[PDB]
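Q: Hi! New to this. If I give you a protein sequence and the SMILES for VOQ, can you show me the bound structure?
A: Yes, paste them in.
Q: Okay, here:
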Amino acid sequence: MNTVPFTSAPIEVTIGIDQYSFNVKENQPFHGIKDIPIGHVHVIHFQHADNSSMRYGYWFDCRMGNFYIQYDPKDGLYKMMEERDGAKFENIVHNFKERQMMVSYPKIDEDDTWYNLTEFVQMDKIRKIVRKDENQFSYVDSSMTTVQENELSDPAHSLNYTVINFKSREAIRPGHEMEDFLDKSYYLNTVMLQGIFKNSSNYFGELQFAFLNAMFFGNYGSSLQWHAMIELICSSATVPKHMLDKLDEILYYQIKTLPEQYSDILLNERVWNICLYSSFQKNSLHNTEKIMENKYPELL
Amino acid sequence: GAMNSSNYAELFNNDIKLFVDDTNVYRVTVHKTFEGNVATKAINGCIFTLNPKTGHLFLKIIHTSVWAGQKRLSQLAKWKTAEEVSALVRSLPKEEQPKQIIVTRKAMLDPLEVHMLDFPNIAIRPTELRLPFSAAMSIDKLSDVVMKATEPQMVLFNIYDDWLDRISSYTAFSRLTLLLRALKTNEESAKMILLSDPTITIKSYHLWPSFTDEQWITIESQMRDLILTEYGRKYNV
Ligand SMILES: Cc1noc(C)c1CN(C)C(=O)C(C)(C)N
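A: Thanks. Here is the predicted structure of the protein with VOQ bound:
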């Protein structure tokens, strides 16, 4: 089990770690989060009490370094930093543990939620979507735009998701216009899976990362990317059976985890009705269709 | 965006544009089978592609063989329309290619946009105008060339005959849409009006009769009356 220590908490803030969250008061004696499961990426995220504008946070993997948070009063946010000195950091983590100034990552033993949401998410792929190569962790916030959004403005602060555009020469073979537009299998299997992502695991990893950024930061371009990646599969008549079965599991846990009260802004009615009731795969997403119909029957 | 009453004079400016109407691409007669089921029989169709400024009509005849062995013909028809319009554009010299293509039915937007990806600078637009181009097959000479076709064929017409020698494009389009609206509302009456006076003929190289300016005013008034006459007969007013 790993630990993210905090030098202090000088401003009142709601702190999230993965799907969990807790409130810290101004100058409360909080010095971080312990018992973080090894083996998964994690996200530690923030929403200030005095300005809920900007949720922001950091994707990290404790296997890649020793990371801690300290608030910067100049830039006005909690920053993630790496300590190279293992000895000193291990000592800092121990002294804080002894004084019981840390919250415990509150994972129920039965509970596979976080694994199920991050199954295909790798830190090495996050760092190619979020470019800041001098750090081992990745900063995301509510306002960051995607490369695709920027084409339709600061490039260094963008989310470099794979561009998906159903009315593009990449998506449409000359002479197969109707075929490729009505059945997106060529675009899914040859262009995206074989060509760009190399395998379905990398595709699912980007899909899952896009969802998590939409949910945790309200990042609108991330929500667009998540839905586009769903729609590209659902709109394909020829999808490997193992991908359909895995997609159903991925979406099920995503819909299960979504706050009931954020559905109006995180779920696109057109995409979901198309995918569940019109598309080629309308009968291939049994688990997802059942949870959607029982949890969000209004959307449908 | 969409073309409507507010931006109507844009049709007659000097930016090349084409209307595309796909109504008459896929045409069928519905009939009973020996077993008492229903079946369709396709008949030849046409794409109606019109430059409203010049009157140039690119009538692409759609022969029934294009449907042989195909499924979902009403959907295929929009894509075949878009394929043929795209082929037409590629066939034109660069300086004759349209800047905009206005489709008369919104279901043509995606088929045409996808077929025109190679032309990102050609705008594909809908319209809120209810244009009467479906009645094109009530123009005898157009109907004749479509029905007589034994293979795919493109035939070029000027739908304004020689009117532009005497009137502006705006007025010529207004006359055309009035004529077509009448033929669409009551084809028999409309055609009676157009031919009632045997001394006025249709030239071999024209589609409509050789009316004088004064006779066109009379004809135009008779067409308006017809549209109103039918409108009362229809709604009881
Ligand atoms: C808190 C916490 N976690 O790891 C470390 C390391 C600290 C304390 N940090 C702030 C330090 O000692 C220096 C000054 C080098 N940044």
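A: Chain B touches chain A at residues 76, 79, 82-83, 110-111, 113-115, 117-118 (CB under 8 Å). Let me know if you'd like me to explain how to read the tokens.
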